[PDB]
Every structure is written in structure tokens, then in C-alpha cells.
Amino acid sequence: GIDAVYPSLVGTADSKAEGIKNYFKLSFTLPEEQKSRTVGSEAPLKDVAQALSSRARYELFTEKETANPAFNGEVIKRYKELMEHGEGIADILRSRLAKFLNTKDVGKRFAQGTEANRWVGGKLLNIVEQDGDTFKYNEQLLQTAVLAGLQWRLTATSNTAIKDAKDVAAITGIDQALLPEGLVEQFDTGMTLTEAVSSLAQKIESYWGLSRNPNAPLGYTKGIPTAMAAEILAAFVESTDVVENIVDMSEIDPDNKKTIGLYTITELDSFDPINSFPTAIEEAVLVNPTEKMFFGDDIPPVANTQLRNPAVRNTPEQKAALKAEQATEFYVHTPMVQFYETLGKDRILELMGAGTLNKELLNDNHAKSLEGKNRSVEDSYNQLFSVIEQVRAQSEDISTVPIHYAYNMTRVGRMQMLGKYNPQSAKLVREAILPTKATLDLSNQNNEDFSAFQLGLAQALDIKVHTMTREVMSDELTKLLEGNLKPAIDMMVEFNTTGSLPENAVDVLNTALGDRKSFVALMALMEYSRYLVAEDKSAFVTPLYVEADGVTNGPINAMMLMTGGLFTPDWIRNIAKGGLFIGSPNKTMNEHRSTADNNDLYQASTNALMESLGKLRSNYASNMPIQSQIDSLLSLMDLFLPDINLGENGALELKRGIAKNPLTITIYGSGARGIAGKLVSSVTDAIYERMSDVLKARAKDPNISAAMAMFGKQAASEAHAEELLARFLKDMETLTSTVPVKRKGVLELQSTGTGAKGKINPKTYTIKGEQLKALQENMLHFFVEPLRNGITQTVGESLVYSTEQLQKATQIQSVVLEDMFKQRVQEKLAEKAKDPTWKKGDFLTQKELNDIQASLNNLAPMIETGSQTFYIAGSENAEVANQVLATNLDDRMRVPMSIYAPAQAGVAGIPFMTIGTGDGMMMQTLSTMKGAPKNTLKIFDGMNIGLNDITDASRKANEAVYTSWQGNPIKNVYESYAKFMKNVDFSKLSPEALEAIGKSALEYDQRENATVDDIANAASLIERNLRNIALGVDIRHKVLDKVNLSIDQMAAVGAPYQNNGKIDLSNMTPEQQADELNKLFREELEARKQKVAK
């Protein structure tokens, strides 16, 4: 059967036979039903090129009556060229194989009997055939692989998934939220060796169209496709189809000299015809193509398993949510497409970027950080027009073709749109393809619809709409439109009429928008300009939207979901900052903010930080040099990072749902030193941007002074401008020359002997090495440590305790799962070492891996709440196999064998549960509830809504928040941890595992001599703590549900959800409500205490 198709492949198809054995035929089998149309082909590159040579032959080859309308003469010509290029890739590959065989007599030795086909660098010999005195690739397999490589080169850029929190952490060893901005965009923009090789291998294996033998070693089932992909990748690197760029950690950790190589595929012109139908190869080769667009009635199916967690099945409710989001119809908004097209790529970048693309006017470091950001916008533009060209083939009027997007649940229960450049992830794409639409009566400025229209325009222009009443936002919007935006609006009106823009368009837009510039702001200008000239203003059609956006969502959800203690007036006051209003019927965030408390949770955290810093100053009051160190750090931050609340604010950044605010990353467990490094990175990035400002200023007006060119935003006079420059220089010298060191519990200043000094060259200015570390130390001791001290008083001591217990339990359980998995893997490897047919490097079979994974069941690896399923330890790591999977023929591109398996969770448990049961549940509920809002775009903690439904959709969103607040993540962890504790056996763990566990279950002084029985008792106590917290959480929710609540967490519109609790707590102070709520708390506790005994 299989030997029949590849009869001439070197070696014998018998695992237990003397002599060279063919592991390709041993590892794969023909499928029951045909998968690839290239299987029985003698020359696939030739057959497919022929199929692609004309519509008629494409139709015959694919058994279709008519081919995709996009497949025309221009596209056919491009594929003709791509195919010819494919022949050139095959030539390189065949040439590399010869070289390989001709080096160190390999092949000679192979032909003699040496099993080089079992070497990590020779697994490709399993698909060669004898040709005279040497060997050659089996043309069918080589060619099909090239075809896969060609498809990969065409769509891998956009098809590649966004790297999640674990991938990035695993790549650098640093939490994603703590990496410098430029590096994040770099990773989300390029592919790691493992990434590129892995995705290429998947296509090659798919095209080969065979099925994996479940009892064959992964060393070959995965290894063979992987070795082929490595060769192809090298081939592409040689042809320059793929370019590798290398990044480092110099911006975050000077002591880490480790570098990371990234591969990016050369871009095709955004107008290249082939982009209008980039999957012709895929459609020709595969009976059931994976890559394809979903237009009209073609709807994506519902994924059965969780993204990156094959062992987790999406629950019934998660599936219905995915179905609901996939059912939504998205439509092209022609005006923005035309606007993007006329402005062009370069101008879009100059606008959202640094105002120029001439690296001579950019500080070296600033330029570097713009690289990843620039290609991200570039790639989103290219993917947008590729979709536009495709849609355009379906209909002349591109705005009438429905577009559907596939989604899947992530590790944390978020619904992520597949792809990298789609409406959800790419801000540029988001303003051109929308599901939001409304017909508005804008005939009178006082109409309900006109207010909705202004709200959408104001929010898009960065007016903080949830922070003020509708009237005030209306006033602020009008002032912008009559003032600064005036020149831009006029430019837009002219564009919609003539179809052209001025050469200084970027200049116009930039001067008008200032730091309000974003892609959505462009949609605001465009829509306002369209309204102005609309003939029938009583029925204005527009996709402009209003995003119901969560207020400091992460922290607020944690506070409301994990707090187990009694109610405190401070908790009542602070939770109100997140939209939970008690005893205030119909209260909105807009009112709270403009009438009750204008400080959000982030501001409160900052105020508490300053309070703690104040105490610190006191303890060293007499120490003048320390007061100066502190003054210097604060003045520097006040100069470049006055607002520390970091987020995905960059106009050029992708939207990933990564929490970056220091309050939030602290609660989620990020380390102090790591946070300090991130804040310094934020400060230095701002400094570099200013340096670029100096350069651009000097060039435009050589008269402008250095001081003014650098600090003109905080200085009207030269005397003050110069004051700021001198302060900046003194701060930098002081912070890089002296550092705080904690010795004997007290702080003392020490000399670094490396303090910065000299004439600043804006183009070159750079803070790295010892100077960067010095800044980090000052940042840690004089900002970050006091920040942590105040977060406790901001979110509540009770919440902190809950997160600590959650962290410890999930980490402990993870260690055990990881350790047991490794030991069984090792035991299995010991057995196979007794097998003569086995050789070290073959590793296990899929069946053996699946068995081992299944053996972990009694340890409750998964938290199943019935509506969501979480597998915290689930990952893809190389530590299990700890060996190379394969390399290219030059012994380069060595890919580690990575396997799906449990790994140490660390602090992951906190964000995992907060996100999953907080925003994840909110969105899932929004998608599935009765009367679920239609035609929205959900973006994790915010949802875009069409203008005819902003009031009801926002109320439902707030209702969804209330239902998520009925959850108890601590109880879910407890249920799993309890089963874990009932079956775990600590005396089977490895000392390395037992050590890690003791670090979470025991105190420092009890670790060094902690027995296994001590560790077990500590783990049991954590179990008991979890249970009491869980009970406390349930009591609080039950009590809160009985009181009159008004919730406006998903704010903007002012449509709070009313729970209609009968116990009226109005007319009461926080102290009074706390009293009442606690009375109810005790009562409930008593009732639950009674129900038990009975």
C-alpha cells in the first residue's frame, strides 16, 4: 500500500530488520479518503503548474464547474512566475542534497550501511532513492514539499497566529507585559526558527497528504516533515524570499547577552495581482483546503478544541459563543479603503509614526523600535487590500459582500479572531472592515441619533467620554471640530469630492490631531465629513461605532471575584471606581466621574504609591543625598512619563489584550525588578522619542534652541526650557552614578563609577549597560517598592491574600503535573532503550505520549466550571524531550523537539482566572445571552457597537458583567486542587520538584530542612485556605445580589444595568453600607453554618 506508492525509497519498510530502514514508510500511511491531489503524481510541481496555467485546467484538476472569479489572466501569469520560481527552489534543494552527500563521505558510508538516515541531520535520507553511486530526492515528495513551501511564502505572514503570553515568555524568559515595546512588536511581527519551521512543516505534511502512524516515534513523524521544512527555509533564505534579523535584550537586561533570530517573509506589492487569490495552490492541492476566505453564506465551522491546548475541548457554551461571533457579517467601508489607498503606506506610517521615515532625523534607538511597528502597519495594509482584491472579484460593489471571520477560545477563555491582521487585532483593518452599521436621523442636532453620532466621533477622537456627561462631551467635540480639526475636515470634504489629497496631507492630519492620531480618529474625520455633505441627513448610513469599554477591568474583576473577607468602606469606595455602584439607582460612570470621584483605580494606586514614598522619605529625612536621589527619579519621570498607566495606546501597536498597567501587572504577580525594568524602558523610549524631536526641530528651524526643541511642551520661556534641559542632565548623571543598595534592612547609596557625562548627541544618545541597570535599581527602590506597598491599600488586603493562595496552589499543582509527566516519560524511555529497534533520538510515539498525558487525570489537571474549561499547566515545551528534533543539511537551524505537556505555572494562575472568569465570561455571556447584541466586534474587555444600539447593547454588556460577578474562580481552583490533594503522592516527586513546591507552601526559614511530610501538610493547609476564601466569595455575591446595584463597568454610553435588589442601601455612607452588608454577611454565614449540621 504505502510501499506501493514509494517502492524506490531507500531502505526496508521493517522496523526489526537488519540494514538501513525507511522510517518515512514506517511512520506514515495512506489515508482512507484522498487528502492531497498530488499523492499519486510523478511530478507534482509540473501537474499543479499545468492546473494553474488556465481556468479550464484548474477546473478539471479541482473538479469544479467554475473557478474563483479572482483567478484571471493577470493572476494566472503571476502563478506561472511563482511556479517557475518553485523550480528554482527545487534546484537549490537538490543541489544542497548533493553537497550533503559529498561531505565527510556521508552517503558513501550510507550506501555502505551506516544508518545516517537516523541522524538528527540526516532524516531526509528517508525520502531519497538510489541513483547510480549516490542518491536523489524522491521527486514526488520533494516537489509536493516545494508547493507547500510556495503557499507558505504567499500567506504565512498573515496566516501565522499571534504569539500568546507563554510563547513570548518562553522565547525570552521575560513576561510579555514586561518586555520593551519595540521588542513586543518585533516578536509579533517576525517568526522564530521554531515558528517558521513548524508552520512550514505543517503545510508540507498536509500536502504530502498522508496519515501519521500512531505507534511510530515522533522523531520521524514530526522529524521528517521538520527536516524538509528546515531545508526549504534555508532555500528561501538563500533565494532571499526569507530574511533573518536578530534581536537582543539590551533594552531590558544588560546582563542577558542572549539573542533571538527572527525570520520574516519578503513582502509582495500590496497591489500584486496574486494577492487577489493567494491560495490557488492550496485549493488545487488539498481536497479540503485549510486556508480560505469566508464570504457570503460560507461560514467557518466551530472549533472543537481550545487554541494551543489540544486536550481541552471547548465547552457547549463556548461553542455557542464562537458560533455567534462567526455568524456576524462584516462589510467593507469603501470610503476608508479609498482614503487608505490615496494616502498610501508611507504616508500612513509617517502620520502614525515619527512624522518622517528618514532615519537621519531619528534617534538610533527610536528608529529601531519603529521597525517592528512599521512592518506591522505595512503588513496589515497589505492583508487589507488582499481581502479587498478578493472581495472585489465577488462583486463590483465591494461593500455588499458579507465577510465572516473564524474565532477560537484561547487558554484564558477569550474569543480570538484567527489570523494576525483582522478587525480584532489590527487597528488599520478595523476601520475598513466592520460589522457595525446604523442608519441615523441626523436632521436635527438634538436628535437621539445625533447624540449617538457625536459620542462615536468624540470617543474616536480620544475624548474621555465615560468621564463626562453627554453635554460636556458634545461641547468638547464641537470645539475640536471648530478649532484644530477644521483644516482636516475641509481636506476630507475635498477628498470625498475630487478623490485626491494635498501633498502635505500628513502635515494637515498631524497638526490637526496631535496625540489624538489613530486609525479610528481617521474614521471619525471621514464620517463627519460625509455627514456634512450628505443629501439626506435624516437617514445617514455609517459604520461609526461606540465602544462600551471596561474601566480598569482586570483589577476591578479581581476585586469583585476573589475578595473573600468582610466588606470595608474602602473596598466600596474603590469598587465604585470600576462602576459597581451600591445604593445609587441608575447611577452611571459618567455621573460618578463628574460628580462623585474623578480618580479611577489607577490614579488611586498612584496616590497610594506617593503616600508610601512619603513614609520612605521620612525614614531618611536627615539623609539629604537620598532625598535628592528620590527627587531626581521623580522629576525625570515627570519630564518623560508623567502618566505611568501603560497600555496598548500606541497608534502603531497591535491590540493583544495584554495588561500593562503597573497596578495590574503587580496584582497578577510580575516581579518587582521586572516591573522596574519595564518602567525604565517606558521612560527611556520616551527620551529617545524626544531626541528624535530635537533632530526634526533643528532641521525645520535651525533657530530653535536645543533646550526648547527638547522641552517646548512644558516651556514657554527660554529660561525655563533651559531649566528643564539642565534638570534632565543632572537627573541622568545622578541616577546613573549613584544607586540605592539595601543592606541590613536599610537603604544606602553607592557609587557605580560609571555615571553618564558629556555632550548629548540626540542621534546617538543611548542608555544601556551599567547606566541602564543603575536607573533600574533607583526605579526599583524609590518607585516600584512603594507602589507595591500602596496597591494593598488600593485593592484590599483580602484580595492580595486570595491571589497569594491561588498563586501557591496552582503553582504547586503544576509542579506535580510537570514532574510526574517527566518521570513517566523517562521511565518510558528506559523501556524503549531495551528495544533493539529503538535508538536514542527517536523519542516516544504519539500513543505513548497520549497514555502518559492520560495518567495525570487523577491529579485534576483541568478546572472545569461547566461553562468554561481551563488547563493552567498546559504548554509546549522542549524541556521534556530535551533534544534536537532536526536540523538542515548544514547542521544549522537546529529545531528542538517540543512536546505538548504540563509545565510549571509560576504566577500565571492569577491572570489566568481573573481574565477567564472576568472579561472572558463577560464576552461569552454577551454572545450567548437572550437578546444578545448583534453586529458587534468584541475586543476582550471592550465591545464596538453600531450607533442604533449603543444604549441597549451597553446595558446588556453591564448585565453580562453582573453575571460574571456571580462566579467564584477561587472555588473552581479549590475543586481541582482538592481532587489533586486527595490523590497526589509527594514521596514520588523529584527533589527538584519538592524544592520548588516548598518555595510556595513554606516560609524561607522552613525550607532548608523541610521534610516531604512537612511540604504535604503545607499543601493541605493551602487547600483549607482556598475553601474558606471560596465560601467567603459566595457569601459576598449572595449578599451583594440582594442589595440595589447599578453597574456601569462597560462604560461610555451611560446605560447601567440595574440588578433590582430589594434591600435599599441608598442614603447611606460607605461606612454604613459596609455595616449593613457585613450584617447580611454574618447572617448568611450563620444560615450556611446551620444548613451544614442539619
Q: What are the CA-CA distances from residue 1007 to residues 275, 614, 816, 977, 1004 (Å)? A: 61, 35, 18, 22, 5
- CB-CB contact of 677 with 780 (8 Å): no
φ, ψ at 1062 (rounded to 5°)? -80, -25
Three cell numbers at 121?
Answer: 541531520
Q: What are the CA-CA distances from residue 24 to residues 121, 453, 777, 832 (Å)? A: 15, 62, 55, 20
Give the residues across from 547 on adjacent strands: 944
Residues composing the chain? 1094
Q: What is the DSSP string of 863-931?
A: EE-SS-EE-TTEEEESTTT-SEEE--TTS-S-EEP-EEEE---TTTHHHHHHHIIIIIHHHHHHHHSTT
Q: State in Å, rounded, how far the first CA of the chain is from the last one.
A: 69
Cα distance between residue 407 and residue 425, in whole Å: 12
Cα distance between residue 996 and residue 1007, in whole Å: 10
Name, in order, each residue with C-beta under 8 angstroms of 102's C-beta and a sequence gap of 6 or more: none
Cα distance between residue 597 and residue 613, in whole Å: 23
Kind plus residue range of the DSSP H or E element containing 578: none
Query: Cell numbers 553607592 label which residue?
Result: 750
Angular region, 738: left φ>0, alpha ψ -120 to 50, beta rest = beta
**Residue of 802, 838, 779 whose CA lies nearest to 917:** 802
φ, ψ at 217 (rounded to 5°)? -65, 140
Name, in order, each residue with C-beta under 8 angstroms of 384's C-beta and a sequence gap of 6 or more: 337, 340, 421, 426, 428, 429, 432, 433
Q: What is the DSSP string of 495-561?
A: HHHHS---TTHHHHHHHHHGGG-SHHHHHHHHHHHHHHH-S-GGGEEE--EEEEEESSHHHHHHHHH
Q: What are the CA-CA distances from residue 268 to residues 273, 292, 988, 1078 (Å)? A: 10, 19, 56, 65
Ligand-binding site membership of 971 (annotated): no
**Residue of 603, 969, 1029 whose CA lies nearest to 798:** 1029
φ, ψ at 212 (rounded to 5°)? -75, 140
Ligand-binding site membership of 647 (annotated): no
Cα distance between residue 620 and residue 781, in whole Å: 13
**Residue of 243, 252, 93 whose CA lies nearest to 182:** 252
**Residue of 138, 99, 140 whose CA lies nearest to 121:** 99
> How big, in percent rounded to 5, are the helix, strand and coil portions of the chain?
55, 10, 35
Judge residue 254's burial from the number of C-beta atoms within 10 Å of its C-beta, 0-12 exposed, 13-18 middle, 19 or more buried: middle
- CB-CB contact of 182 with 860 (8 Å): no
Cα distance between residue 561 and residue 914, in whole Å: 8
**What residue ranges in 348-480 does DSSP mark as E strands?**
403-404, 407-409, 415-417, 433-434, 438-440
DSSP state of 296: T
- CB-CB contact of 462 with 552 (8 Å): no
Judge residue 190's burial from the number of C-beta atoms within 10 Å of its C-beta, 0-12 exposed, 13-18 middle, 19 or more buried: buried
- CB-CB contact of 657 with 669 (8 Å): no
DSSP state of 1094: -
DSSP state of 315: P
What three-state secondary structure class fits 158?
helix
CA angle 1065, 1071, 1072 (to 5 degrees): 35
- HSE (side-chain half, CA atoms, 13 Å) at 336: 28
- CB-CB contact of 332 with 388 (8 Å): yes
Could you give the residue ranges of the DSSP H alpha helices within 395-485?
A: 427-430, 448-460, 470-482
Ligand-binding site membership of 661 (annotated): yes
**Residue of 965, 874, 975, 1015 whose CA lies nearest to 312:** 874
Judge residue 614's burial from the number of C-beta atoms within 10 Å of its C-beta, 0-12 exposed, 13-18 middle, 19 or more buried: exposed
Q: Buried b / exposed e across 197-221, counting CB within 10 Å, b at 16+?
A: bbbbbbbbbbbbbbebbeebbbbbb
**Residue of 867, 878, 860 whose CA lies nearest to 982:** 860
Amino acid sitting at position 48: V
Q: What is the DSSP string of 69-127?
A: TT--HHHHHHHHHHHHHHHHHHHHHHHHHHHHHTSTTTTHHHHHT--GGGSTT-GGGGG
Ligand-binding site membership of 949 (annotated): no
**Residue of 921, 919, 920, 923 whose CA lies nearest to 933:** 923
φ, ψ at 1009 (rounded to 5°)? -120, 30
Question: What is the CB neighbour count within 10 angstroms for residue 271?
Answer: 12
Question: What is the CB neighbour count within 10 angstroms for residue 1039?
Answer: 22
Cα distance between residue 882 and residue 308, in whole Å: 20
Q: What are the CA-CA distances from residue 210 to residues 77, 129, 406, 633, 959 (Å)? A: 31, 19, 26, 62, 49
Ligand-binding site membership of 29 (annotated): no
Cα distance between residue 566 and residue 1083, in whole Å: 12
Q: What are the CA-CA distances from residue 483 to residues 459, 486, 716, 820, 1023 (Å)? A: 17, 6, 21, 67, 62
Judge residue 161's burial from the number of C-beta atoms within 10 Å of its C-beta, 0-12 exposed, 13-18 middle, 19 or more buried: middle
Name, in order, each residue with C-beta under 8 angstroms of 546's C-beta and a sequence gap of 6 or more: 452, 455, 456, 459, 944, 945, 947, 950, 954, 1052, 1053
- CB-CB contact of 70 with 389 (8 Å): yes
**Residue of 347, 684, 655, 688 whose CA lies nearest to 500:** 347
- CB-CB contact of 695 with 365 (8 Å): no
Judge residue 7's burial from the number of C-beta atoms within 10 Å of its C-beta, 0-12 exposed, 13-18 middle, 19 or more buried: exposed
Cα distance between residue 343 and residue 163, in whole Å: 30
For strands 331-332 and 403-404, give the pairing: unpaired
Amino acid sitting at position 333: H
Cα distance between residue 393 and residue 68, in whole Å: 8
Cα distance between residue 458 and residue 465, in whole Å: 7
Kind plus residue range of the DSSP H or E element containing 582: strand 580-582
Handedness of CA 543, 546, 552, 554 (dihedral sign): negative
φ, ψ at 761 (rounded to 5°)? -100, 105
Ligand-binding site membership of 379 (annotated): no
Question: What is the CB neighbour count within 10 angstroms for residue 851?
Answer: 13
φ, ψ at 270 (rounded to 5°)? -65, -20
Instruction: Please give the resolution of this entry in Å, rounded to 1 decimal.
Output: 2.0
Q: How was this structure determined?
A: X-ray
**What residue ranges in 918-965 does DSSP mark as E strands?**
937-938, 942-946
Three cell numbers at 997?
Answer: 513546591
**Maximum distance among all Cα pairs of the chain, rounded to whole angstroms:** 96
- CB-CB contact of 941 with 437 (8 Å): no
Ligand-binding site membership of 428 (annotated): yes
Cα distance between residue 359 and residue 369, in whole Å: 12
Give the chain's domains with CATH numbers: 1-301+873-906 (no CATH), 302-328+401-444+536-552+907-967 (3.30.70.2440), 329-400 (6.10.140.1360), 445-535 (6.10.140.1370), 553-577+1067-1094 (6.10.250.1860), 578-598+1043-1066 (3.30.750.220), 599-793 (no CATH), 794-872+968-1042 (1.20.140.110)
Name, in order, each residue with C-beta under 8 angstroms of 595's C-beta and a sequence gap of 6 or more: none
Q: What are the CA-CA distances from residue 699 to residues 386, 596, 703 (Å)? A: 38, 48, 9
Question: What is the CB neighbour count within 10 angstroms for residue 618?
Answer: 9
Three cell numbers at 444?
Answer: 436635527
**Residue of 380, 392, 390, 386 whose CA lies nearest to 345:** 380
Name, in order, each residue with C-beta under 8 angstroms of 128's C-beta and a sequence gap of 6 or more: 9, 10, 97, 135, 136, 137, 138
Cα distance between residue 260 and residue 314, in whole Å: 34
- HSE (side-chain half, CA atoms, 13 Å) at 588: 18
Cα distance between residue 951 and residue 1010, in whole Å: 59
- HSE (side-chain half, CA atoms, 13 Å) at 544: 30
Amino acid sitting at position 494: E
Cα distance between residue 1039 and residue 966, in whole Å: 11
**Residue of 344, 338, 389 whose CA lies nearest to 499:** 338
Cα distance between residue 408 and residue 419, in whole Å: 11
Amino acid sitting at position 131: D
Cα distance between residue 505 and residue 513, in whole Å: 12
Could you give the residue ranges of the DSSP H alpha helices within 191-251?
A: 193-208, 218-221, 223-239
What three-state secondary structure class fits 36?
strand
Instruction: Give the chain's radius of gyration (CA, Å).
Output: 31
- CB-CB contact of 415 with 304 (8 Å): no
Cα distance between residue 509 and residue 518, in whole Å: 10
**Residue of 263, 249, 246, 247 whose CA lies nearest to 174:** 249
Q: What is the DSSP string of 244-277?
A: EEEE-STTT-TT----EEEEEEPPPPTT-GGGGS
**Residue of 1027, 556, 582 whose CA lies nearest to 796:** 556
Cα distance between residue 141 and residue 123, in whole Å: 14
Give the residues across from 433 on adjacent strands: 332
Ligand-binding site membership of 222 (annotated): no
Cα distance between residue 1018 and residue 719, in whole Å: 63
Give the residues across from 944 on adjacent strands: 547, 937
Q: What is the DSSP string of 660-696?
A: --HHHHHHTT--HHHHHHHHHHHHHHHHHHHHHHHHH
Kind plus residue range of the DSSP H or E element containing 838: none
Cα distance between residue 870 and residue 973, in whole Å: 10
Give the residues across from 417 on adjacent strands: 407
Cα distance between residue 148 and residue 110, in whole Å: 28
- CB-CB contact of 909 with 815 (8 Å): no
Give the residues across from 686 on adjacent strands: none
CA angle 249, 158, 164 (to 5 degrees): 45
- CB-CB contact of 380 with 428 (8 Å): yes
Ligand-binding site membership of 551 (annotated): yes
φ, ψ at 568 (rounded to 5°)? -120, 145
Cα dihedral value 349, 353, 355, 361, nearest 10: -110
Judge residue 567's burial from the number of C-beta atoms within 10 Å of its C-beta, 0-12 exposed, 13-18 middle, 19 or more buried: buried
Cα distance between residue 933 and residue 917, in whole Å: 20
Kind plus residue range of the DSSP H or E element containing 750: strand 746-751
Three cell numbers at 429?
Answer: 483593518
Sheet holding 191-192, edge to edge: 191-192, 260-265, 242-247
Cα distance between residue 148 and residue 206, in whole Å: 8
**Residue of 813, 811, 747, 809 whose CA lies nearest to 781:** 747
- CB-CB contact of 651 with 427 (8 Å): yes
- HSE (side-chain half, CA atoms, 13 Å) at 314: 22
Three cell numbers at 225?
Answer: 516533515
Handedness of CA 501, 507, 513, 518 (dihedral sign): positive
Angle between helices 193-208 and 139-159 (to 10 degrees): 130
- HSE (side-chain half, CA atoms, 13 Å) at 253: 18
Q: Buried b / exposed e across 784-807, counting CB within 10 Å, b at 16+?
A: bbbbbbbbbbbbbebbbbbbebbb
Ligand-binding site membership of 941 (annotated): yes
Ligand-binding site membership of 554 (annotated): yes
